[PDB]
Structures are given as structure tokens and as C-alpha cells.
């Protein structure tokens, strides 16, 4: 699961080049197969790592097809791969018959001549076709060891082995919202309590065989969904011949979430010419929206 977190952060790379895939939109694609190619170049010689660019470090050491479709990186290591008394540790091939093929590696070590010529070290002009770099400390910008990491992205006919990261949402608590905790779908109010779950227990149900709570798959293992407000709304009418004002009688509610739903237009039986002036809450309240709680008898 390629997260691509170390590539965006720590902006210290010299050349962050992407050819086929977008440099920004990478947390959503599902690549078929990825590969890594690591090598150390000498300073400004990193100019032939693009499709079409030819030269001496493009057909003798590492080749590249016309359609690479991937990103490449390069970070400076002058303070690591450089000494003050000789850093002869990296070499490159610059003499070979023809050009290399896409994704080809050759570790041969033998003098080359396209006329036979076994090339005993002195024959007339025979020499080793491998020159060493000039890595030192007191040099210029164009003579510094650069480690180029080539990320070969592929989209061949294969299942989605490598994909982007899966960003989780925020934890909206104390509100009747939809929840999806890795398969557990539905709608409820996320509120904590004083229960004690076991380390191996992932989710928990109630006595009515209904999902009660579950640890957050993300982090901060706490309780989970509580049921929302519901019931049978009744109408209190003192008689059509007497008056024409009524009052809602929401069966079993706290008279606090219903007011928020009405003020935010969230309740299903939302009348168009209805308002709210006062809310009373008792045992089996039936919030009397439009009535006064007088202390008489």
C-alpha cells in the first residue's frame, strides 16, 4: 500500500521528475507493479533520465523506453560520498557495441573492440572501458554525487497489487450521522460511555442482537454509535369549532435534538408553516411547541 508520504514531505530532493503519472494525484491510483532503480551519478550528468534524451549515460549504463510512465527522484549526498583523499568508488560504462535495450543490465568487465581484437591490455590501444568519477570535497556543484532513485510505475494486465493510502474521515460525535467502520454501515449518534472492551474484541452488540459499540479502526479506541431520536408524533387539538392551534407530541425524545433538527431543517415531517416558541420536557414529554407550562391545577 504505497503511502507516498516520504516523497511529498522533506523537500530536499534535487530533481523530482514525473513523466507519465501526475506528480500530485498519486494517493488514488492503483498501480500494477512498482520497481526501484538506485544509482549514483556525478553532478550535472543527470540530464538523460527522460524518454528521448540520449548521450553517454543513456545507452551504455542505463536505458529508458519511450514510454516510462513513472516518477524519478534525486537527492544530493556530497557530505557522504566524498572524501578529501580520494573517493574512487563509482565507475560507469561508456564503450559498448550499439545501444542498450529498455530495462537491461550488463555487469561485464572486458575491453571492447568491434573488430574481434581480444585486446590483451597492451595491444596497440587497448584499455579498460570503465572510467571512475571525480568525487571529492573541494569541487563544484556539477561534480557532486547524486543518488537517483527511479520508480518504475506499471499498469499492465494484473490486479491492483499496490494502491494509494485510504484517508479516514473525522469523528463527528453527538450527532445522528451515517457511520462506516470497516463494513459496519448504518446511522447513529456516536457517544462514549463507561464500558470496558477486551483487546481482542473489535465490535460489540447489545442484548437485542444489535450492534452497540465498536472500537474506532483508525485510533483512539472508544465507544461508538448510540440510537437516534424516533417515535410517534401526535397532534393535540382542542376542537375545530373551538380554535385552530395545535401542539406536537413527539413520543420519546429529549426535546433538545428535535429543536436542533427543526432549526436546521432535518426532521422528516417538516411542516412549511410551522415554527417554535417554547419547548417543555417531562417524563414522556411530547414537547408542547405552542403551549405554556403553567404551575396551576
Amino acid at each position, epitope marked *: 500500500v504505497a503511502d*507516498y*508520504s516520504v516523497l*511529498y*514531505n522533506s*523537500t530536499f530532493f534535487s*530533481t*523530482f*521528475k*514525473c*513523466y*507519465g*503519472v*501526475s*506528480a*500530485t*494525484k*498519486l*494517493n*488514488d*491510483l492503483c498501480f500494477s507493479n512498482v520497481y526501484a532503480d538506485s544509482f549514483v551519478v556525478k553532478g550535472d550528468d543527470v540530464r538523460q533520465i*527522460a*524518454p*528521448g534524451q540520449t548521450g553517454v549515460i543513456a545507452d551504455y549504463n542505463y536505458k529508458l523506453p*519511450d*514510454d516510462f510512465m513513472g*516518477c524519478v527522484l534525486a537527492w544530493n549526498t556530497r557530505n557522504i560520498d566524498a572524501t578529501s583523499t580520494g573517493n574512487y568508488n563509482y565507475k560507469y560504462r561508456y564503450l559498448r557495441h550499439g545501444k542498450l535495450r529498455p530495462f537491461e543490465r550488463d555487469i561485464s568487465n572486458v575491453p571492447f573492440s568491434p573488430d574481434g581484437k581480444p585486446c590483451t591490455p597492451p595491444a596497440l590501444n587497448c584499455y579498460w572501458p570503465l572510467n571512475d568519477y571525480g568525487f571529492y570535497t573541494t569541487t563544484g556543484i556539477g561534480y557532486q554525487p547524486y543518488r537517483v532513485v527511479v520508480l518504475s510505475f506499471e499498469l499492465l494486465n494484473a490486479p491492483a497489487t499496490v494502491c494509494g493510502p485510504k484517508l479516514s474521515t473525522d469523528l463527528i460525535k453527538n450527532q445522528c450521522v451515517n457511520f462506516n467502520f470497516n463494513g459496519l454501515t448504518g446511522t447513529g449518534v456516536l457517544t462514549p460511555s463507561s464500558k470496558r472492551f477486551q483487546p481482542f474484541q473489535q465490535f460489540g452488540r447489545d442484548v437485542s442482537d444489535f450492534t452497540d459499540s465498536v472500537r474506532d479502526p483508525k485510533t483512539s479506541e472508544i465507544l461508538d454509535i448510540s440510537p437516534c431520536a424516533f417515535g410517534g408524533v401526535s397532534v393535540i387539538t382542542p376542537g375545530t369549532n373551538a380554535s385552530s392551534e395545535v401542539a406536537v407530541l413527539y413520543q420519546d425524545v429529549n426535546c433538545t435534538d428535535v429543536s436542533t433538527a427543526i432549526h436546521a431543517d432535518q426532521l422528516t415531517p417538516a411542516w412549511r408553516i410551522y415554527s417554535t416558541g417554547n419547548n417543555v420536557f417531562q417524563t414522556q414529554a411530547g414537547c408542547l411547541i405552542g403551549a405554556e407550562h403553567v404551575d396551576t391545577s
Partner: antibody
Amino acid sequence: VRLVESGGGLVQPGGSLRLSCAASGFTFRNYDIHWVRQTTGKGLEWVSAVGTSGDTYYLDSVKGRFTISREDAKKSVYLQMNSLRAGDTAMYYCVRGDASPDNIYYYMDVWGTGTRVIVSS
Amino acid sequence: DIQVTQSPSPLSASVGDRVTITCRASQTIGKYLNWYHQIPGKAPKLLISAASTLHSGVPSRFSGRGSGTDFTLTISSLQPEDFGTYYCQQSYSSPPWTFGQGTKVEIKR
């Protein structure tokens, strides 16, 4: 989807002056934000752009000088211009790029209005 | 980088319906090449997609073709309100994000 520019440029080369780019009702949490430089008859070279993650890219010429900052809830993108030179006076825009399937290309369809940082006096 | 060139001289407009707006480059690209349009006076805008993803906003008369390394902009009968400079941007290299040069379409007189 529409963006409105603000501010401008009045300081001399060698000072600091930031810009801003607003947004609209579109969901500005997964798309990107780019910058366009129009010098009225020259090239438009800019790659500096930030995304949802910690992606902070800069141009090869002007690197380590101009900083980028975006805010999802505020729906505003800022661009501070530190160590301004004399050859950067042009019109700055703000666009949005996106790909159809996942990564085909960048749209850059919705443009803005444009802002100039005329230096000197 | 991807050296993209355009027409050296701006082509005018007439009663015809054939233009020579090209977006040739150095390397070869399959479909990683878009097309824009900048009216002189206002901000630019997207005109032609990558020949297969034409979106809304732009009329269906504005067509787009391209294959191999030679790209051509096949436009239908031009309109007096659809003139300006047409730009194009390559999509084969992310660091060197560069636009076109400019192909103004003025009216024959």
C-alpha cells in the same frame, strides 16, 4: 466554480508581499491549485503548487524563495513573495487542475482574474 | 525538457473552416497534450481536451485530433466571438510545466 483575485504589488525589489486566491462553493479539499505568470508576450513558466498532502513543489529557477500555503476551511491560497527581483513583474493567476479517470492530465479550465506586483515606484 | 513549438506566424480568419494551429514537440507523446485558448483582454480558458475527453462549455464544433508526433487542431466554421490566441501544454514532464507560444486568429480584411 470561480476564483476572485485580490491585492497587488507596490514594494521595491527586495521586500515581502503576499497574495491571495479565493474559492467558491465547489468542494476544495481534493483538487489542486496552480499559478500562472502572464508577462504580456513572454513565457508562462510555473510549477509551484500544493495539494491535500504535504506536497510542496517549487520552480527550478526560483527555488527556496517563494513559499506556498493553502487552507481548506478558509478556501484561500496565499503566496508570499520573498526577495523579489526586477524581472518578475507580471500578472499572476489561479487555476485548478484535475484528471478525468485518475491521472490523464490537468484540466486548468477554471481561471481567475489576475494580479500584478508592479515593483519600483 | 519537452521542447514544444507552435506556428511561427499567426493565421488569420476568413469564411473558410480550416486552420493550421499545430503543437508539435521534440519527443513523441500518445495523448499527453492538451489545448487552451486565451482571448486578448481576459483570462485564458480550456478549449480542446486530449482529443477524446471533450467537456462542456466548449461547443461541439471545436474538434481535436492528434497521433504520433504531429498534432493538428481541426476547427469547424469559426465564429467572431471565438477568436484569440490558442495555447497548448504538454503532459509528459511535470517539473517543466510550460505553455505554448501563441497563435492569434484575427479576421481577414
